[PDB]
Structure 1
Amino acid sequence: EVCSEQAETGPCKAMISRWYFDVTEGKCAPFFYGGCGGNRNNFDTEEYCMAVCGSAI
């Protein structure tokens, strides 16, 4: 679902730090969000991403 979605920066051209779940790493990683669009694999903090996604929190 949302947890397997590719990290999408979107069409806008800002640089905002966020987190997404990487299925290969089996954990969360940082990416640069563009400010709009994209998808829900997009979290404000690492902890929150790991909370929603993967493993056995």
Structure 2
Amino acid sequence: VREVCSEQAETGPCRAMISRWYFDVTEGKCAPFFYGGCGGNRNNFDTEEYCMAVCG
């Protein structure tokens, strides 16, 4: 749903190691990243399928 999909990926300040997916706007595709468990932002989806389904 686009505004979410332009935000830069963010780990946040917490120190857990959760693999998440974010949409990358230059490359037009969901890429994986590591999320720390708190904070961060909306470009943070649990799967590739759900990420491309929102932003692709």
* TM-score relative to the length of structure 2: 0.93
Separation in structure 1 between the aligned mates of residue 17 and residue 26 of structure 2, nearest angstrom: 24
Q: Deviations over 1:4-56 (max 9, x none)?
A: 000000010011000000011101000000000000100000000000003xx
Structure 1 gaps, min length 5? none
Separation in structure 1 between the aligned mates of residue 21 and residue 47 of structure 2, nearest angstrom: 6
What is the total number of aligned residue pairs between the two structures? 54
Structure 2 gaps, min length 5? none
Runs of 4+ aligned structure 1 residues displaced above 2 Å come to none
* TM-score relative to the length of structure 1: 0.91
Instruction: Report the RMSD for the aligned CA atoms in angstroms.
Output: 0.5
Taking only the aligned residue pairs, the percentage that are identical comes to: 98
Query: 3-state SS of the aligned residue for 1:50?
Result: helix
